[PDB]
Amino acid sequence: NVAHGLAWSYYIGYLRLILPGLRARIQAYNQRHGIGNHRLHILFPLDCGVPDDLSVADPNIRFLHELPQQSADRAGIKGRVYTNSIYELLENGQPAGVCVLEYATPLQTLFAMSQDGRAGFSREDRLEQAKLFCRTLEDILADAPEAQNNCRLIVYQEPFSLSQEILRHLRQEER
């Protein structure tokens, strides 16, 4: 039952660490190089298919630029680096949305566990933990309104246009 650990790890060791300073980094980027939405948009594919490059697997998702990095001495690691990536969403091939976008890496852990031969993780076990991971994280954010307001949770299950799914969320947020 790894979902409970993955969710608290994801929240303690990343979300509540990176979300406070995200708006200022987004503002800094708009000063030099716009990005209307100032939330981290996290993708939650329950199939746990997490490619390393987002834009390489979709013509309507295009990498734009890195945000200004955020460095910190972390647990004996001097200058641990946290980078987030700006992507533009394309509709008929002409910018439709721009936002800081990434996957929820804990799902990548669930997938690799399902592929590990030295483990008893089945694709049914993974989908069970994938839902339980999302629910646990959502329960944490429900009592953390600042972090909850500083990110967007995009939960879906591919049987589809990911760029359309993302743009649907961006248009809902504009209200």
Query: Contacts with a copy of itself in 93-122 (CB under 8 A)?
Result: 101-109, 112-113, 116, 118
Q: How many angstroms separate the CA atoms of 36 and 75, rounded?
A: 34
Q: CB of residue 129 vs a copy of itself: minimum separation in angstroms?
A: 9
Cα-based distances in Å from 95 to 59, 124, 149: 12, 38, 25
> Whose CA is closest to 60, among 153, 170, 173?
170
Contact 36, 98 (CB under 8 A): yes
103 in a labelled binding site: no
Closer of 57 and 72 to ligand 2BA (Cβ): 72
Q: Tell me if 83 contacts a copy of itself by CB under 8 A.
A: yes
Give the Cβ contact number of residue 146 at 10 Å: 10
Q: CB of residue 156 vs ligand 2BA: minimum separation in angstroms?
A: 18
Q: Which amino acid is at 96?
A: A
Q: Which residues bind a copy of itself (CB under 8 A)?
A: 1-9, 12-13, 16, 43, 50-54, 63, 66, 69, 72-81, 83-85, 87, 101-109, 112-113, 116, 118, 143-144
